[PDB]
Structures are given as C-alpha cells and as structure tokens.
C-alpha cells in the first residue's frame, strides 16, 4: 500500500530524530554526574555526624558506579545508532529491489531490527537502575534532614531532584523509542507480505 511505505519511512525518520535526542540527553547526564560528584565527594569527606556520613558515602558509592553505567549507556546508544545506519542502507535497497532478489537482505533488515530492540532494552534497564538508585537517594537525604535544617544537604537534595527530572525524561524517550521500533516491525512485516 502507498501510505504503508510512507508510514514506515515516517516512523524511521522519527526514530532517527529520537535516538539523536536520547544520545544528547545521555551526554548531558554524564556531564551532569561528573560536575556534581565533586560537590558530593567534598560533602562526604567533610561530614562529622556518623548518620550523615554513612548516607553520603552510600550515595557517593552509587554515583561512582553510575559513571560506569552512564558510559555503558552511551556506548549502547552509539551501537544502536550504527545499527540504524545499517537499517537505513538495507531499507533503501529493499525499496530499490521491490521484493526481488531473494530473502537474505530482508532477513538482515529483520535481524538488525530485532538487535536494535535488544539494545534499546539494555539501554532502558541501565537508565532504570540509575533512576531507581537516584530516587532511593532522595529518601536517604530526607531522612537525615529532619529538624536540623542542613543547608548543604538541601543543596544536594535539590541537585539530585534536577537529575531525576532528566533521568525520567531519558526513560520516557526510551519507552517512545521501543514503541516506534514495534511500529516499524508492524508496518515492515505488512510491506514484506504484500508487495
Ligand atoms: C520486522 C521488522 C522490519 C521489516 C519486516 C521491515 C521491512 C522493510 C521493507 C519491506 C522495506 C522496503 C519497503 C519500501 O520502502 O518499499 C523497508 C524499508 C525501510 N525500513 Fe524497514 N523493516 C523492519 C524494521 C525496520 C526498523 C526497525 C527500521 C528503523 C529503525 C527500519 C527502517 C527502514 C527504512 C529507513 C527503510 C527505507 C525507507 C525508504 O526510504 O524507502 N525498518 N523495511
Ligand atoms: Cl556534620
Ligand atoms: Mn548517578
Ligand atoms: Mn543520587
């Protein structure tokens, strides 16, 4: 169908734009975590009260692991972008061949499609682990704020909340990505079967 080829194309274009957005946010997140970890390190080190200290150390330890997770998250994004390039090239050739020349190309396109979905899943799980940790930190900071006031702690809290906003955005973009890929597979399977 004519609008079917159009839809696949439009979904694929949307997806390219989305993946660029996801990569960009991930860069901003990594930058963010590295900018803020120095402030956290110094808080942890300067803390005298044992309650505050064990909590700030838990948070620091987590943020240290998050650097590695953020690195792996970005590598995963790059890998997906490289697969997209292959989907675009193989996709173009599929269009050019108009259903002819055997199934090997169509199968490669399908494999790439399966494999990018797997990458997005891994990507979602990395983001989800980070988010879960960051939300746990909010509970921890709130616990040691109590009556005191804790000027510096309130600063950390504010900063952790800003990060969480970005982490939610990231997971949101991710969900949408996995949605577009499902729609691509749906529209793609139809095209193959028809023409
Ligand atoms: C089971 C999954 C999929 C199947 C069966 C499939 C099938 C096809 C077919 C038959 C074509 C040629 C249709 C035509 O334009 O005449 C095509 C083109 C294309 N596909 Fe897919 N596809 C799948 C998944 C994906 C995914 C996940 C992406 C991108 C993330 C993608 C991107 C493209 C692109 C860019 C084209 C070229 C569009 C054009 O300019 O004509 N495909 N695909
Ligand atoms: Cl103190
Ligand atoms: Mn973190
Ligand atoms: Mn945190």
The residue written with tokens 């899943």 in the block is 121
**Which alpha helices (H) appear in the chain, and where do they start and end?**
2-46, 50-97, 104-145, 151-194
Range of the domain at 25: 1-195
Based on the structure, what is the number of domains in the chain? 1
Q: How was this structure determined?
A: X-ray
Query: In angstroms, how far is CA 176 from the centroid of its own chain?
Result: 11
Determine the distance separating the centroid of ligand 2 and the alpha carbon of 52, expressed in angstroms.
Answer: 7
Give dist(CA 195, CA 191) in Å, integer. Answer: 6
Residue 185 near ligand 1, beta carbon < 6 Å: yes
Point out the ligand nearest to the CA of residue 53. 2
Ligand 1, atom 36: nearest CA belongs to which residue?
91
Please give the structure tokens belonging to residue 4.
């079917």
Residue 19 near ligand 1, beta carbon < 6 Å: no
Query: In angstroms, how far is CA 51 from the centroid of its own chain?
Result: 33
Ligand 1, atom 4: nearest CA belongs to which residue?
188
Contact 86, 112 (CB under 8 A): yes
């Amino acid at each position: 169908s004519p609008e079917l080829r159009q839809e696949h194309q439009q979904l694929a274009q949307e997806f390219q734009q989305l993946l660029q957005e996801i990569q960009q946010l991930g860069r901003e997140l990594l930058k963010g975590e590295l900018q803020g970890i120095k402030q956290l390190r110094e808080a942890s080190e300067k803390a005298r009260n044992p309650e505050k200290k064990s909590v700030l150390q838990k948070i620091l330890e987590d943020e240290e692991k998050h650097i590695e997770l953020l690195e792996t998250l970005q590598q995963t994004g790059q890998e997906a972008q490289q697969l997209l390039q292959e989907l675009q090239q193989t996709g173009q050739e599929l269009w050019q061949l108009g259903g002819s020349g055997g199934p090997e190309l169509r199968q490669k396109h399908q494999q790439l499609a399966q494999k990018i979905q797997q990458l997005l899943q891994k990507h979602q799980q990395l983001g989800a682990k980070i988010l879960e940790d960051e939300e746990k930190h909010i509970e921890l900071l709130e616990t040691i704020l109590g009556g005191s006031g804790g000027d510096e702690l309130r600063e950390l809290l504010k900063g952790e909340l800003q990060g969480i906003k970005q982490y939610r955005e990231l997971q949101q973009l991710g969900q949408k990505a996995q949605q577009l890929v499902q729609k691509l597979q749906q529209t793609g399977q139809k095209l193959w079967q028809l023409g």
